[PDB]
Design a binder for this molecule. Structure first.
Ligand SMILES: [Zn+2]
Lengths: 365, 1178, 60
């Protein structure tokens, strides 16, 4: 089975010539015969609902059958890498999602994995507190211990020269990528820090911890001084994700709530995303659509939201049979992957026009 | 590094159309707009019907929506234009200036109105109340700006957040003001819970309508009427006029009529509604159509004209009852027409179809036998989306010009789309077709007369003698008497009604009947200039004396013009007015320029002063009633001589003034016409001609000869003619051997008998021949060794099978089923000799193969003495849905020469396919590199060597998501990704290694890429979806590029149009520079010329001065428009369209601006004119 | 047309082409064992004028 994005790109390129934008785009009928009229999400910018990937594609699982903590796409979408509890990276093809290669990367569960803004480096942390450097060809070039306890998430700077790490020691540490030398140590979280995010352009660090008194803190990486404390959630903020527009902070937490904040004005909340029956654990902004994002849950629910809409624009309550750890969007934005605690990773694509959505993830047959 | 942008060809596409009172409230005009271009047309009932251009304006910003309104006691309709992001400009025509006057510009570009969404996807949509009580502009998709109008003409505007409006109006598909309401009622068609086709099984009835009553005074907007269960595929709404009222909502598969009181009425236009809509829809009988992308307008009440996708025209009838309640729909299929983007109803019976995809058509409808029939009355030329452009050598050039050292080139453009797809041949300059050549040294001036329609004599003037050539079946020197051949001649022409001939000499004036001479009265300073128009003939001496001669029945009478000599007359002009613009049947006027710089126009029979300009030579922008001008010509052009034009020669500058009406003084005013014509025995430079190949116009002689043509369309055309160098004298020539041709002297004393080429049309901004293809033109490639054009074309066929992974299932549906369109591709061969397609030279692609790229590539060959061989390469992709692995083919085609088939000369050229094999992935891009074929197959870029009939791979490299465009120069390949920007590659022949030198790390959705060639600097010109031009440089020593791994943005420019094709030509300083040419997707052609640093700095100070101290159309900011992505920038590209405003300024205003910017007008003019001169190709 | 003949560049020497030949701004390859990937063949190493060995950012 295959999800080949090339026909969509070719159709978009042809339509790109004579259509000014989607207002000139000819409508696709909800019929199975209009297969070659589909375009990637970049084509339908006025309708983000196309990228609500509630169509199941493939369940990708390892032979070890162990929980999957982080899934990431190769920056050009050629491959997908999963970080598992066995400290291994499994690579899956971006078109025919088959197993390609496996390697014992870390000695402890892979909790963090991120690619540099330039498509040259993949930084991965693990449960033992080490940080590893990776080449596009999955070659390890450097290894050092950043924290004495588990590192949860790492984020890169726009120029990829500096990166931040969050650990269970309650400290966020800024590092120099070339030197592997820590420059600042950020303190103020009383409990384990579970998520860290670097501002897309500006020099800002947003962090989320288990400390109820200091749930979210904003940092100044160059000076090392905390800028603000955000009393967003009352229970274990799990995710902090700044949108690439540099204005929105997206926070998932154990309090069954996902929240959106304007980092310029943190007095109030822009939006609260209710609809998770259980704890909200994962989240991922859409690469193409600004306001669209997908969130995961501890019961296995995988929901879709858009900024400005009260209720979910879609979702699958039984997407996984376990807590969803990581959500990764394909660079083109037409395939969504989900790493869950149920020892499996699943690929979700856009629903083909003319489908009677009576499958187990949408309805009952 | 530094460069200047110049627009070679203006955009032709049209996107908005309306029929409003542009000039006055006594006549309504067709106001159309495209991308930064606004046109105002008139409807001419005598020509047959033809659209006459009345005005044209350019903006520093693309129009996003256009509308009109009559505000309060106004003499004409105001125009409401919206520009990207949030700008609303209210522009009104200025009768006293013949220009656009800005009434107000409203800015709504605040971060708080954007709600954190940096990427704007909602164009500002301006709507007007039918009653003219307010105007609404939907801003960012969530803010509704209400601009009230007083019933000083405007009221303070307020912004309504549609999200906090009773309900939550999200998305918003369309919004229209409704008829028949006491207060402005705006009907918003929106989608609170958006869905898309594909997720309909879980969400079907998502669209809704809400009618909000806008209270202007109290700023309250309550909801008065609402529906919630409309079909998801609603696309647009149309307010039905007052007698019926309500709203007609267009859905993709259905048509709905909705009103406040009656229950909703809707019908299903096809069987596709079943299972995708729960709305109650009747089955409309006999109709299988789709209303997804359709333009509609109300020709009258209860009847609608709808233009569908595919161009089909339908007449929709609202069948009602005695209570005006719609109960049924009647659909009548009229004749098909052009793919339109806008529609508007002119005077009843006429319907204009604005189009940016093919030529815009003006239609006429008549009731047949209810039903209507449509006929085409006019057609506005539109070189549509320029998907690709090919440069090639014209097939026919004169043997006289064969040895010219500047190459002769033409541009072939893949324009239009679908049924309107075509090939456009574009040439900037006119190339004469020389019949025979005469070498006649010593003749500096010519005149051609009509002997008792055909020209019978050719009068040539020497320094001390005169040559008379009698023209007929043979041209022989006339040595017989009758003509004054013993001295030079000042002027020779036809007097009366082409029955007599008048010949002017410095000694006197004589009347001539053919070879016979009637009488010769001496005239006494020697005569230096004479003007002849009707019996009235005026004579000017060397000292400014003016003498007038009248043809009194026939004999030339003497009449002394009463003129007080305050200042010496330096030049004269006569003009016959046939169109009654010179109001205060034929009437006669004399244009006169004095030494003190005052232009005076007199009524010729009585010599009464009617017009006066206080400071004429300075070149004022607008001439109103009350140095060293060398020549003036006042002529009426257009249909039935409708457009009076004034051409002025002064101090190496050309002044063109377009006469426009403005109310015992002459009720006419002149407006300067922008142009780029450089002027850097009294011989007249301006030669008026009628009927050269059917065209009326004026020829301008000098260093830069030009053709000034104005047809019945009313648009001024200026075509250069420099293939033969400067032209000294010019004359029309109608002969048996030279039918409707012309006649001119080259600067070498040679005389050309030449005619205009027939295959081109000169009624366009560029001489163009548009070849209809009836299918979509994708790529065009020119072959040099065969001198032919290869074109990849696709046509739409109904889809009947669905590939599955390989099996195909036949689409079995109902009879009312709309089959999807399937494209079938073919490669055509076009002969430039006769632009018809070559028979039996057509290659058909496979069933689902799509031509993603087709290029002409030079590859190594041993048979050719040179290294390269120059084939044509094509790359294809089998589009069979996302569920099937896409793979492609490489097609290497050679055009050979064979014996022509009898009776078919074009059959000499035929394809020879050398390579056609299946690739290991989709072939998405192609180019050549040192004789090696470079192909982007899948997510890798390969390099092949063509030997025998098999491609051997040499080197490959991994690349980005999808490489669509790819160009190379000197083993440096520049590859562009669809959304991950550009990458620079290097090929080393010795090691056979393909390596990545640098790439742009930041994401960018690239349209096409080229190179910017300087003396030693190599740039990378990039075009993006945001309509911007970026120049990237490889600067390893720069700090921003960490190790030479980041391409640095060094020049930035926002061209208001998308660019998909590029080409480069050498300069016509400028030692090793190449102009980067590009054709936009809006039908325009632009260039980007590299420039020196000091020249750039001086012209940048000039540009800043022009931006600051000069008012602009619609109040837009030229600097803000050219800023990148505003609707980290490096402003290193200048705006030639803005820099051209210095040429349009008067000599005075130029002097003060040069004083302000601390330089001199002569230096600024030299720089600007050098930029103009080096780019005079095609 | 046929750009290569109407607009010839073979007589033009580009500063960009000089940079790749002389390897301007060739920073030493970091993280010994980086193994690189898309690096070009080192021109200096061909003529035995490459000071960096194994540490060079280009193929040898
Ligand atoms: Zn080296």
């Amino acid at each position: 089975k295959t999800i080949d994005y090339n026909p969509s790109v070719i159709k978009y390129l042809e339509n790109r010539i004579w259509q000014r934008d989607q207002r000139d785009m000819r409508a696709i009928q909800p019929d199975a015969g209009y297969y070659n009229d589909l375009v990637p999400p970049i084509g339908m910018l006025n309708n983000p609902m196309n990228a609500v990937t509630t169509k199941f594609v493939r369940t990708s699982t390892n032979k070890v059958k162990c929980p999957v903590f982080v899934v990431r796409w190769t920056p050009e979408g050629r491959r997908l890498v999963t970080g598992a509890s066995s400290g291994e990276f499994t690579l899956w093809n971006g078109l025919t999602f088959n197993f390609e290669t496996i390697l014992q990367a870390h000695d402890s569960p892979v909790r963090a994995m991120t690619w540099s803004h330039n498509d040259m480096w993949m930084l991965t942390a693990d449960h033992g507190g080490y940080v590893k450097y990776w080449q596009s060809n999955m070659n390890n070039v450097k290894m050092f211990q950043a924290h004495k306890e588990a590192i949860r998430e790492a984020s890169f700077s726009p120029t990829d020269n500096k990166f931040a790490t969050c650990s269970d020691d309650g400290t966020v540490r800024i590092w120099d990528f070339l030197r592997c030398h820590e420059e600042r140590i950020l303190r103020g979280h009383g409990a384990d820090v579970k998520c860290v995010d670097w501002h897309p352009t500006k020099g800002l660090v947003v962090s989320g911890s288990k400390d109820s008194q200091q749930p979210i803190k904003f940092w100044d990486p160059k000076t090392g001084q905390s800028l603000a404390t955000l009393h967003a959630h009352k229970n274990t903020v799990m995710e902090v994700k700044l949108n690439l527009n540099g204005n929105w902070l997206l926070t998932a937490s154990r309090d069954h709530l996902c929240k959106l904040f304007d980092i310029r004005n943190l007095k109030e909340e822009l939006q609260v995303f209710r609809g998770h029956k259980k704890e909200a654990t994962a989240v991922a902004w859409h690469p193409v659509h600004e306001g669209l994002f997908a969130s995961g849950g501890s019961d296995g629910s995988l929901l879709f939201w858009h900024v400005g809409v009260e209720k979910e624009v879609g979702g699958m309550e039984m997407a996984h049979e376990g807590m969803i750890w990581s959500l990764a969007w394909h660079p083109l934005g037409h395939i969504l992957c989900s790493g869950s605690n149920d020892h499996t990773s699943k690929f979700w694509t856009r629903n083909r026009p003319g489908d009677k959505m009576r499958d187990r993830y949408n309805l009952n047959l | 590094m530094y460069a200047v942008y110049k627009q070679a060809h203006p955009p032709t596409g049209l996107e908005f159309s309306m029929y409003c009172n542009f000039f006055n409230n006594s006549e309504r005009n067709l106001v159309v707009a495209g991308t930064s271009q606004l046109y105002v047309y008139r409807l001419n009932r005598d020509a047959r019907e033809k659209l006459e251009l009345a005005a044209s304006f350019s903006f520093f910003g693309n129009v996003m929506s256009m509308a009109s309104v009559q505000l309060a006691g106004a003499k004409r309709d105001a125009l409401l234009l919206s520009f990207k992001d949030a700008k609303l400009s209210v522009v009104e025509y200025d009768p006293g200036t013949h220009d656009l006057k800005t009434l107000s510009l409203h800015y709504f570009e605040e971060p708080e109105l954007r709600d954190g969404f940096v990427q704007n996807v909602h164009t500002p949509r301006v709507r007007v109340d039918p009653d003219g009580r307010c105007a609404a502009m939907l801003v960012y998709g969530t803010r509704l700006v209400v601009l009230p109008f007083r019933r000083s003409s405007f009221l303070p505007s307020y912004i309504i957040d549609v999200r906090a409006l009773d309900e939550k109006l999200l998305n918003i598909i369309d919004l229209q003001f409704l008829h028949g309401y006491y207060e402005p009622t705006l009907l918003i068609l929106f989608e609170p819970n958006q869905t898309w086709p594909g997720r309909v099984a879980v969400r079907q009835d998502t669209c809704s309508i809400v009618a909000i009553s806008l209270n202007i005074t109290q700023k309250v907007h309550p909801v008065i009427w609402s529906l919630t269960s409309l079909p998801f595929d609603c696309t647009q709404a149309l307010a039905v006029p007052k007698p019926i009222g309500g709203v007609v909502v267009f859905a993709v598969n259905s048509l709905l009529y909705l009103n406040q009181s009656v229950p909703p009425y809707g019908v299903a236009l096809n069987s596709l509604t079943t299972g995708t809509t729960a709305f109650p829809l009747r089955t409309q009988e006999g109709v299988r159509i789709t209303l997804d992308c359709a333009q509609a307008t109300f020709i009258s009440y209860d009847k609608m004209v709808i233009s569908l996708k595919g161009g089909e025209i339908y007449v929709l009838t609202l069948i009602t009852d005695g209570m005006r309640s719609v109960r049924a729909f009647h659909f009548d299929k009229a004749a098909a027409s052009v793919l339109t983007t806008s529609m508007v109803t002119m005077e009843p019976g006429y319907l204009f179809l604005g189009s940016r995809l093919g030529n815009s058509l003006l239609l006429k409808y008549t009731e047949k036998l209810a039903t209507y029939s449509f006929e085409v009355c006019d057609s506005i030329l539109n070189i549509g989306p320029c998907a690709n452009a090919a440069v090639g050598e014209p097939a026919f050039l004169s043997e006289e010009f064969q040895n010219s050292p500047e190459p002769d080139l033409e541009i072939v453009v893949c324009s239009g789309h679908g049924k309107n797809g075509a090939l456009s041949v574009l040439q900037k300059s006119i190339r004469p077709q020389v019949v025979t050549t005469f070498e006649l040294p010593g003749c500096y001036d010519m005149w051609t007369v009509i002997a008792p329609r055909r020209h019978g004599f050719l009068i040539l003037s020497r320094e001390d003698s005169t040559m008379i050539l009698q023209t007929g079946q043979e041209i022989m020197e006339l040595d017989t008497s009758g003509f004054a051949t013993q001295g030079p001649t000042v002027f020779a022409g036809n007097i009366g009604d082409n029955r007599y001939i008048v010949q002017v000499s410095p000694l006197g004036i004589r009347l001539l009947e053919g070879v016979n001479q009637l009488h010769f009265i001496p005239v006494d300073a020697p005569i230096v200039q004479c003007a002849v128009a009707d019996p009235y003939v005026v004579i000017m001496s060397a000292e400014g004396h003016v003498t007038m001669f009248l043809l009194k029945s026939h004999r030339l009478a003497l009449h002394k013009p009463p003129l007080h000599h305050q200042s010496k007359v330096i030049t004269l002009c006569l003009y016959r007015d046939l169109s009654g613009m010179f109001t205060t049947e034929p009437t006669h006027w004399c244009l006169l320029v004095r030494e003190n710089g005052t232009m005076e126009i007199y009524q010729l029979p009585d010599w009464r002063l009617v017009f006066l300009v206080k400071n004429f030579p300075v070149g004022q922008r607008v001439l109103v009633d009350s140095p060293l001008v060398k020549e003036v010509l006042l002529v009426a052009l257009g249909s039935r001589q409708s457009r009076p034009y004034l051409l002025v020669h002064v101090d190496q500058e050309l002044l063109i003034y377009e006469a426009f009406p403005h109310d015992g003084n002459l009720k006419v005013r002149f407006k300067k016409v922008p142009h780029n014509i450089n002027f850097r025995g009294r011989v007249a430079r301006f030669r008026y001609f009628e009927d050269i190949y059917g065209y009326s116009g004026v020829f301008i002689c000098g260093p830069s000869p030009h053709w000034l043509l104005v047809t019945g369309r009313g648009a001024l055309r200026l075509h250069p003619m420099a293939i033969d160098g400067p032209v000294d004298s010019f004359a029309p020539f109608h002969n048996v051997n030279c039918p409707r041709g012309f006649l001119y002297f080259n600067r070498q004393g040679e005389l050309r008998i030449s005619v205009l080429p027939a295959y081109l049309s000169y009624d366009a901004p560029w001489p163009v021949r548009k070849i209809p293809l009836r299918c979509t033109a994708h790529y065009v490639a020119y072959h040099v060794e065969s001198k032919v054009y290869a074109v990849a074309t696709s046509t739409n066929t109904p889809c009947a099978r669905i590939p599955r992974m390989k099996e195909f299932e036949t689409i079995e549906r109902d009879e009312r089923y709309i089959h999807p369109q399937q494209e079938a591709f073919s490669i055509q061969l076009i002969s430039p000799v006769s632009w018809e397609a070559i028979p039996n030279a057509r290659i058909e692609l496979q069933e689902w193969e799509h031509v993603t790229c087709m290029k002409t590539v030079s590859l190594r060959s041993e048979e050719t003495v040179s290294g390269l061989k120059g084939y044509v390469a094509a790359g294809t992709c089998l589009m069979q849905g996302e569920e099937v692995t896409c793979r492609g083919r490489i097609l290497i085609m050679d055009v050979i020469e064979v014996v022509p088939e009898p009776g078919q000369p074009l059959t000499k050229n035929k394809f020879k396919v050398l390579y056609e094999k299946e690739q290991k992935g989709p072939v998405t891009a192609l180019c050549h590199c040192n004789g090696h074929l470079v192909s982007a197959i899948g997510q890798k870029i390969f390099l092949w060597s063509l030997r025998a009939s098999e491609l051997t791979g040499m080197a490959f490299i991994d690349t980005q998501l999808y490489i669509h465009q790819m160009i190379s120069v000197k083993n440096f390949i520049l590859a562009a990704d669809v959304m991950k920007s550009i990458s620079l590659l290097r090929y080393q022949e010795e090691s056979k290694t393909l390596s990545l030198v640098s790439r742009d790390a930041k994401p960018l959705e690239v349209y096409s890429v080229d190179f910017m060639v300087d003396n030693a600097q190599l740039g990378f010109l990039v075009s993006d979806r945001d309509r911007n031009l970026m120049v990237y440089m490889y600067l390893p020593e720069a700090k921003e590029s960490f190790g030479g791994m980041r391409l640095l943005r060094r020049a930035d420019f926002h061209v208001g149009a998308h660019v998909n094709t590029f080409w480069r030509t050498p300069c016509r300083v400028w030692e090793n520079k190449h102009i980067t040419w590009f054709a936009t997707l809006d039908g325009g052609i632009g260039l980007l010329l590299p420039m020196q640093e000091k020249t750039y700095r001086r012209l940048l100070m000039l540009q800043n001065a022009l931006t600051t101290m000069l008012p602009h159309h619609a109040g837009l900011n030229p600097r803000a428009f050219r800023m990148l992505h505003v609707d980290n920038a490096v402003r290193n590209v200048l705006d030639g369209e803005l820099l051209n405003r210095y040429l349009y300024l008067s000599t005075m205003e130029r002097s003060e601006l040069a004083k302000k910017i601390g330089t001199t007008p002569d230096i600024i003019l030299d720089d600007l004119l050098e930029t103009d001169r080096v780019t005079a190709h095609f | 047309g046929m750009q290569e003949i109407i607009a010839s560049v073979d007589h033009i020497k580009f500063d960009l082409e000089i940079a790749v030949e002389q390897q301007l701004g060739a920073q030493p390859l970091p993280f010994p064992g980086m193994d690189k990937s898309g690096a070009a063949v080192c021109e200096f190493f061909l003529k035995a004028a490459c000071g960096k060995g194994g540490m060079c950012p280009f193929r040898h």
